[PDB]
Amino acid sequence: YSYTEKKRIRKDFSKLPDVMDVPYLLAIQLDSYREFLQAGATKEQFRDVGLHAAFKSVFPIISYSGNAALEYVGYRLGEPAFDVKECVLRGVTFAVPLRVKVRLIIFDRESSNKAIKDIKEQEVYMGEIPLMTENGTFIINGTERVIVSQLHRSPGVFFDHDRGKTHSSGKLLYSARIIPYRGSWLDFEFDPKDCVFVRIDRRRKLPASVLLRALGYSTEEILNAFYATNVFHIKGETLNLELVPQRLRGEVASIDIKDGSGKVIVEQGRRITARHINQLEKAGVSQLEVPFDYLIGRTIAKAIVHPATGEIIAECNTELTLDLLAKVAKAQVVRIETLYTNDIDCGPFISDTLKIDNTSNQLEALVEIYRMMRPGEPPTKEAAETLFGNLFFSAERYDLSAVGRMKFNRRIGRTEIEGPGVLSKEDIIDVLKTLVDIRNGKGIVDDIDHLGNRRVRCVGEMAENQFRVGLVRVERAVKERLSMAESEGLMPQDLINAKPVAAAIKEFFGSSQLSQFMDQNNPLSEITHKRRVSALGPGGLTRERAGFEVRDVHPTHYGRVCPIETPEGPNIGLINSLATYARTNKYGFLESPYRVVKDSLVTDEIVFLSAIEEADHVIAQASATLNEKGQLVDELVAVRHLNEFTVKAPEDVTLMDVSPKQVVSVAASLIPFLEHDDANRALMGSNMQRQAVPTLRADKPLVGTGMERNVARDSGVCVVARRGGVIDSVDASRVVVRVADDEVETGEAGVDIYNLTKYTRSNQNTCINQRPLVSKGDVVARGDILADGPSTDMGELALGQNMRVAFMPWNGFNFEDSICLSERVVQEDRFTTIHIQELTCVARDTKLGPEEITADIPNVGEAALNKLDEAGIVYVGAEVQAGDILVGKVTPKGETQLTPEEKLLRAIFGEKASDVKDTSLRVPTGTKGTVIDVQVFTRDGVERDSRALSIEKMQLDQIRKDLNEEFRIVEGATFERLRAALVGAKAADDALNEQLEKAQAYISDRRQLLDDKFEDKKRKLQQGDDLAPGVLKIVKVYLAIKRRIQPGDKMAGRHGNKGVVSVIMPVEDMPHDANGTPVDIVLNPLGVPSRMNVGQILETHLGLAAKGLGEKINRMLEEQRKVAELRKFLHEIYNEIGGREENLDELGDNEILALAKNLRGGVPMATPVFDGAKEREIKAMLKLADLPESGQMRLFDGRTGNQFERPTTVGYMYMLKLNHLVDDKMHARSTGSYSLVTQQPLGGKAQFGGQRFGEMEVWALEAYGAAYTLQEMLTVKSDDVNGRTKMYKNIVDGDHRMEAGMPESFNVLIKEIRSLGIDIELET
């Protein structure tokens, strides 16, 4: 049992045991980077699938008319210089050296092993690997950035219909566009006129005859391959037709067939019915008599040429007429080729497009395919062949994956498993014959929206393709330079070039859509951000191209993604969160584990099922009753076989779910009573819970789920113990623990330094800190929790703070969704958060004079320089107001050209003419706080001030006092083991002499590790950080603002009930019960019948029973009760109606009172997502805590004093505080700065920002009888020069003259029109 479990135990309401615990939530990001970075060092030949595999495709090169080759054994990863805490303080990116070894291989290109030289040497550091931390994020330029997973289509062929209203047709074949793993894609769309017109991604439409001729096949054979399924011969009575019973099925027969040795088939003028099909199949005849007048409507397939006359007597695509038959009869034609195509058949469409642009030969298609590749360029036989053959044979970037070959062959049917990567002549005819089959009706279209057509990428696969492009270009310059110059004079260091590698990997991590900012406003928001699968990005569909095909949930997404966790707004359905139990497979597909079940006994092993492997077996639901025997005791079970939810029998089941929480995501599983809430509020509840702000005090939620522990444990924000032992000393700055003798090494057994982070700035201007929750002398096991992060309480996720909530309309203050707070929520400092806002100052270098941080400021007084030092930096901890000077920055200037009116005032008050303008940094209006620290940055060759000397001195004293204190701990840990050699009791002899010299050498060796590190840390403080050119010194400050709650903030719960607080009513006005407990939050009961979120009332009833039990223990603990009186009452709580709980394991008097003192403010309950407590298990808790059965008690009025004549639902409800305060949205302005071209107001003055008066508000003013109002907001209030200045004088004088003026939006349009050669004037 964990040490934190004994302190607080939550009662679970799960009715079924969990056979599989929750795995690592960040396993998708950690396992994806260990394959790309390959930081593991093994002794055998590792595979290292990832960057190592791509690196192996660089050394083997081939040069035309030359001999050049390279050999690369492997790469080496160096150690990073800056630590994880120093890289975020100063401006630097967390990287690691990457040194490779490339051996140059020079040959003579003579196909012989003679005159071959090879040189082995280590190359230069090719770029710098990011080497992200164990939390799943990497630091870039001091900021933490994460990369979300990409969701793209699987490589293969897909057939769709695209039934739209623009085609004006019920049946129209869509584009059968294939998507390879890399390169361009071919868009082959079938024309609505039974034609085939291929196209490219950035070219025009091309005919099918030009594309078929480039492969090498003729146009006549390709057109006769898919057609001409019947042959005609001139035998017997000058004609013999192949009798097929399928063609004559359902068609009228106007030609009499008298053949068949006296056995007639049909007659002239008789309709073929179901009876005529029986007399033809029983005989098996194939020849029939057809007159010559019946072939007047039939056409030929190919060009019928006779070997007698030597000329084509009948060309292709021509009807058989009377005069044409006279020429074919005298020419002695053996076989007549006639394409038998009718309305009942499919019909060949290759003949309708074969006559496009007269592409009857391969020579006409070569000059036509080159016009789309090169625009306006001259057509050549060599250039056209290279462009056309680049996507068929000379595949430079047309590589396909190993799974893409088997996926494309599975739709058309093929016995071969793996084939060639690029497309061949035989591999391109299957997609052409498969589109005509689906056009007639044979078969169905492909499934693109299913999970089998989409592939989830990762951070390792996205960084591998971005690294191969940056490496394939660096090898091109080294290959050409090695052949132009000599090989003996050249060196592998000068031949290699690490510039294209480091540049292509640095700009990619900053200019990509997937490498977005990582939000740290909530520990729950940190987990759900990395556990996201994005669709749009570098290659995905945008918000408009997607449409509605991907914005709908599908049954194939069961157990893989979340259907109720999707941000609503401009992009809904595109991005989705991953499931809890979802695990990525080897190929990259999402696989969810199931429990295979048989007809004899339920198995214990867990298997992983893929997306396409679910259509074969049947999967049941975990909500099935069992008879404690391992079989399905229920008569029926809800199963699904063909991706459809239905009912099945319990005798043919094969699969079963693990836990009901495998469907929802992490952000949706924490919502209690999710089965009682609508999916509309569940989609909104996961967004408000993600935007929570950590408060000052962490209050545990009384109604939880149980997954809150798995969110704060795996995160890298809490101080998790790596090894076990006993805590030596607990301090607010750091905590140290010992190492047990079992899991310890030989030397340096006890070494554990855990440095707790202080109040630093996050990415959302929120505070973050760690507080120790352990004591000195406690047994800590491996995997415990030593310090909690923001919005965490004892390893449990505690975002907000719960309080008493009543449901009643109180004087209309809770009109629709508003919240009526009390005075007890503000006086107790509950929702008062801490915000950390930073401000940075730069020192620009100009030709008029360099800018430096000085102490003297022109035109100031003593009060402005009272808080400032003698160098120009505000002291640490100085309380600053809105408008004070923080950093003294002056800018020199020349040629001021002062006015005589200002010169007269400079001599009266005795003010000296300062020729240097004051451009110091000042805080904006409305932002006041306390500076916590000041960080300065200097460049090489620049002088420093006295303020920077105090920063490096405090950093040098801290790095010296702590290293001297940690050395004393290890010194005492070595003498205590040497003092255990008192078996002789002198107060054998050679063994103690060696151990004494070894213990003295270990102390002398440990000092050498600190002296080399102290001198290395001293060098880091004496060096200047690299900055952008033009900045002499950068001095940044950090302010600490405590934004308490005020009327206007947004408060919401976990069920999706937003609310803006209206007022803060006193304690005397809040409704109180007969005991005298005034409520804090007064909600509105009108949201329950409108919005289907019943979980608000179920959580409120459990919140009243959770506090009622905690108050009973507090009264029993203060009554000086015995031990038998406390453990007997606690046993009646955890084991009263159900749940898995274990007792009789704590201590007698130590652990019993340690658990009662933690539950004195409320016993926390654990209600699962779908395995929550029933109505009986909740109503039974109100009877134990001496509470009403219905949960509704009548309260007394606070103001009038009377009693309400209706029971009111009271209790405790968990509430949150969103980051939508009024301090960042309320602003107003009257005058300000304007732009240059268009005289419109804008920001930049650090005062406010003007709002836009769109066209929607213009039509509203015209709806009334407003004429001067709309004319004022368009000419005087904006877009003017003389009108605004003259109007401001009228307001001060007292009379509103309302001058006409002229809008500046029209004066610019006149100058732009007259400059285009078109005249415009005013006739008046």
Partner: protein, 85 residues
């Protein structure tokens, strides 16, 4: 005619040898071309190289907006230096 600001002939020839010297020193050191690094190689003071290398401003367009979405250009983000309020 290439740059938007016509430079005299007697001063534009000094920038031709500075760009060629910075091109060879870019691949020779395998690092970014520093302003003080070229001064030591060409035997020139630091105050002379700072003004000569800083003369090439490389002015960019204004109507071209930055970012993936072109919602507003740079014309609506500039302000005047004189008193316009």
């Amino acid at each position: 005619q290439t740059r938007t600001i016509r430079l005299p002939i007697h001063v534009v020839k000094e920038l031709n040898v500075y760009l060629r010297a910075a091109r060879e020193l870019t691949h020779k050191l395998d690092h970014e071309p520093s302003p003080e690094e070229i001064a030591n190689l060409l035997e020139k003071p630091v105050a002379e190289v700072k003004r000569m290398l800083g003369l090439n401003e490389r002015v960019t367009s204004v109507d071209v907006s930055l970012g993936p979405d072109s919602d507003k250009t740079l014309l609506d983000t500039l302000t005047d230096d004189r008193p316009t309020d």
